[PDB]
Amino acid sequence: MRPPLIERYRNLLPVSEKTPVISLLEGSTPLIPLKGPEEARKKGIRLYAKYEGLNPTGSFKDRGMTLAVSKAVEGGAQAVACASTGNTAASAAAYAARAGILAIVVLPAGYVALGKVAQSLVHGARIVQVEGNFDDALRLTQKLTEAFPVALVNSVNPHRLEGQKTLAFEVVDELGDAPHYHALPVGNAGNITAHWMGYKAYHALGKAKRLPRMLGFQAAGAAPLVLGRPVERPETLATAIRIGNPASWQGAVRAKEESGGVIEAVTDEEILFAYRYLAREEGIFCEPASAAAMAGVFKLLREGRLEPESTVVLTLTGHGLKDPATAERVAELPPPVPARLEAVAAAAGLL
Amino acid sequence: MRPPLIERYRNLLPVSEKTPVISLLEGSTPLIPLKGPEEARKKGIRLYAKYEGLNPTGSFKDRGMTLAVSKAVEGGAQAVACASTGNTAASAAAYAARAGILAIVVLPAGYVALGKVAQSLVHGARIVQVEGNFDDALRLTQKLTEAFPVALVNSVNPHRLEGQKTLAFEVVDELGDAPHYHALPVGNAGNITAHWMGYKAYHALGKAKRLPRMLGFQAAGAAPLVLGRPVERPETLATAIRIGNPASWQGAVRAKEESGGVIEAVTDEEILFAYRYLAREEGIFCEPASAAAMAGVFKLLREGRLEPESTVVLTLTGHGLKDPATAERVAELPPPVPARLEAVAAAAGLL
Ligand SMILES: Cc1ncc(COP(=O)(O)O)c(CN/C(=C/CCP(=O)(O)O)C(=O)O)c1O
Numbered sequence: 275m276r277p278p279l280i281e282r283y284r285n286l287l288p289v290s291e292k293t294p295v296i297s298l299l300e301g302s303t304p305l306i307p308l309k310g311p312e313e314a315r316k317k318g319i320r321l322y323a324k325y326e327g328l329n330p331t332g333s334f335k336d337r338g339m340t341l342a343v344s345k346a347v348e349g350g351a352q353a354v355a356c357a358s359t360g361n362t363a364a365s366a367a368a369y370a371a372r373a374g375i376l377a378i379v380v381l382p383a384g385y386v387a388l389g390k391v392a393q394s395l396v397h398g399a400r401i402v403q404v405e406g407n408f409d410d411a412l413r414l415t416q417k418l419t420e421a422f423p424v425a426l427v428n429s430v431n432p433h434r435l436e437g438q439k440t441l442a443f444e445v446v447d448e449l450g451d452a453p454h455y456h457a458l459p460v461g462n463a464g465n466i467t468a469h470w471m472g473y474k475a476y477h478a479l480g481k482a483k484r485l486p487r488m489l490g491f492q493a494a495g496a497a498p499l500v501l502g503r504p505v506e507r508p509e510t511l512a513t514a515i516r517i518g519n520p521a522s523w524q525g526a527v528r529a530k531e532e533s534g535g536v537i538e539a540v541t542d543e544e545i546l547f548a549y550r551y552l553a554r555e556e557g558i559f560c561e562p563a564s565a566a567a568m569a570g571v572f573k574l575l576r577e578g579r580l581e582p583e584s585t586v587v588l589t590l591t592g593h594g595l596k597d598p599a600t601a602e603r604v605a606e607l608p609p610p611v612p613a614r615l616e617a618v619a620a621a622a623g624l625l
Numbered sequence: 626m627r628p629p630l631i632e633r634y635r636n637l638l639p640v641s642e643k644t645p646v647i648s649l650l651e652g653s654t655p656l657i658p659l660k661g662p663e664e665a666r667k668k669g670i671r672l673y674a675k676y677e678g679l680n681p682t683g684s685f686k687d688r689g690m691t692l693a694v695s696k697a698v699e700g701g702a703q704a705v706a707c708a709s710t711g712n713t714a715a716s717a718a719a720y721a722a723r724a725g726i727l728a729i730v731v732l733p734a735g736y737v738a739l740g741k742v743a744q745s746l747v748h749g750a751r752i753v754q755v756e757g758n759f760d761d762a763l764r765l766t767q768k769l770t771e772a773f774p775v776a777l778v779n780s781v782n783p784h785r786l787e788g789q790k791t792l793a794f795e796v797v798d799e800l801g802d803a804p805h806y807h808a809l810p811v812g813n814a815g816n817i818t819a820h821w822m823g824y825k826a827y828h829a830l831g832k833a834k835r836l837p838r839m840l841g842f843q844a845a846g847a848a849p850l851v852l853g854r855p856v857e858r859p860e861t862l863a864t865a866i867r868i869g870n871p872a873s874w875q876g877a878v879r880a881k882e883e884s885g886g887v888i889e890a891v892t893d894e895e896i897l898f899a900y901r902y903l904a905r906e907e908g909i910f911c912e913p914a915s916a917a918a919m920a921g922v923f924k925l926l927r928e929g930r931l932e933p934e935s936t937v938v939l940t941l942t943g944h945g946l947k948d949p950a951t952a953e954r955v956a957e958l959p960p961p962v963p964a965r966l967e968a969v970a971a972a973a974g975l976l
């Protein structure tokens with residue numbers, strides 16, 4: 275029996291008997307141990323993939339949305355709103371539907387994967403596509419929630435992060451201690467901040483004896499945290515993190531500093547390589563943005579900056595089905611052949 | 626948190642200590658209690674959605690593939706093959722990658738959802754598109770495996786059904802007994818056969834006191850089990866079940882008969898209605914084919930054929946992200962507007 279995330283960690287969340295539990299049964303995702311890569315195995319470095327693509331709406335956002343929406347409804351909210359590169363919008367839409375309230379999502383025109391758009395569509399969210407990027411959308415949405423009785427459910431809402439910190443809890447619960455390293459993508463920066471919050475809380479509770487080094491990775495075309503200043507024209511095929519001015523900037527920096535980790539850039543080429551590696555070699559399909567976490571691991575490995583005899587946990591943020599269009603970038607679909615055995619056997623390379 | 630499905634039910638599966646466990650941590654999916662529909666609630670009827678869309682590759686096929694591939698490898702197989710409408714192929718591809726062997730998938734050109742094609746592509750399967758339908762693909766693929774040393778992983782392989790029967794096990798483990806009714810879509814007929822196998826087994830072992838009435842449903846345009854004869858030209862927007870000559874025909878008929886259930890048809894229009902309902906009302910996004918199960922429940926509720934105060938479990942077979950293209954037929958995507966607050970507030974219907 276898979277429990278609502280809010281119930282699994284009720285004692286560690288800002289809820290009470292008065293809180294309406296709006297759950298689609300999120301969290302408690304699998305922690306898949308990885309075979310390699312060989313580059314890691316030879317150094318006594320093993321990897322685990324926290325597969326967040328198996329959350330109800332396909333991404334880790336559900337962890338924060340369940341709490342955010344539940345608390346909003348508790349406060350009487352009739353509607354919720356959020357700007358998004360796709361996943362937060364899909365999550366807000368699904369939970370709003372579950373709760374029976376209105377969901378308004380603002381998206382950057384042309385920079386949202388088809389899977390995500392399809393989700394906001396089908397779940398019935400009121401969609402607004404703006405002729406601008408995510409950063410513009412976020413600025414606009416916050417102003418919208420200041421002029422109308424609509425609950426803002428973007429990461430700036432504390433409940434989003436309190437809910438997402440549970441990912442750290444689950445890793446420790448399963449492994450018995452926090453890992454030496456925890457890698458994940460960084461877009462608006464709420465997740466890296468939530469992970470660290472989770473690890474610190476569990477360490478204070480004594481459930482984790484050690485504190486992991488947080489390894490955050492941004493796409494080279496949208497790496498404000500890496501360059502040290504906002505990026506006016508963020509660019510990258512991993513549109514989930516096509517973000518130039520992260521709202522949790524300070525949270526990310528502190529997480530990096532406090533944990534002794536890093537926040538670095540990986541190229542779109544490196545993202546595609548890791549993306550293909552996970553799917554073709556480990557049998558795990560995550561969207562490009564998520565693959566950035568693995569790309570980061572590959573990077574530090576090749577540079578000898580990951581200590582031997584360590585456990586590395588990767589947070590694969592979203593399922594690959596979120597963005598099917600990118601598959602054609604790492605593989606080719608063979609043209610159709612006649613429905614005759616001969617043609618099939620040849621096409622299958624069995625002749 | 627999720628153990629390999631093979632381990633969870635090791636004692637009830639055809640495995641031993643020498644069986645290589647090829648797992649992506651499948652099974653143990655959530656059983657979501659549905660809010661309605663209203664017609665059900667009025668009769669005290671409760672519905673639960675076994676969300677198979679949360680399996681590693683997004684469909685229930687993983688249940689069968691983990692066993693089929695594990696046993697294939699145990700037999701020394703270097704490759705597996707299967708004809709598919711999309712999901713079985715995606716599953717085979719992912720597990721093949723996991724095990725490190727070859728996966729050959731035969732698909733009907735033009736009739737496999739975008740999400741599914743992306744999966745077989747990215748996971749590295751050797752793809753063959755035939756200018757014919759699924760039925761043709763299965764016929765040709767079986768011939769292939771009768772000649773070549775490639776293990777067939779289609780539902781005709783008994784291991785697929787043994788793996789898939791575990792879904793019934795899980796429902797009983799969680800609910801405490803088998804439900805009064807269990808609805809699911811019927812395409813090639815392997816799943817309904819497997820479901821019944823599972824419930825009978827658990828009932829014989831005393832784990833379940835009752836036996837559910839199996840409710841299978843087919844798309845009106847591809848309903849050979851409803852018409853009583855093979856459908857030469859199956860057609861439906863729910864391409865997953867665009868099948869005219871189910872391989873497990875007798876298995877389906879026997880499950881229907883023995884359980885005291887039925888196998889009826891639902892129109893594409895009714896499928897879209899249930900598809901929209903689940904996503905917009907329950908917050909659950911499943912592909913059209915999966916929605917056929919709910920359409921079937923609406924059908925019987927409407928005909929007053931479900932006992933009041935009964936428990937109904939639905940197997941939502943695949944995640945909606947599998948087929949993003951269909952979203953656009955239940956909702957409209959509004960055109961982009963300027964990145965200005967006023968344009969946004971108006972577009973959001975707030976002014
Ligand atoms: C898949 C993925 N990965 C990764 C990432 C990064 O994370 P962060 O935490 O750093 O951000 C993302 C984002 N996302 C988003 C973002 C923005 C919004 P919010 O509220 O969430 O912040 C959406 O929308 O979807 C995604 O989507």
Ligand SMILES: Cc1ncc(COP(=O)(O)O)c(CN/C(=C/CCP(=O)(O)O)C(=O)O)c1O
Nearest residue numbers: 709710712713779780812813814815816942943
């Ligand atoms: C989502 C879904 N649902 C439902 C169905 C129906 O089921 P069945 O069991 O009755 O069949 C299907 C199919 N599927 C398939 C089929 C054929 C193959 P096999 O081997 O699996 O049989 C694929 O491919 O994917 C799908 O996909």
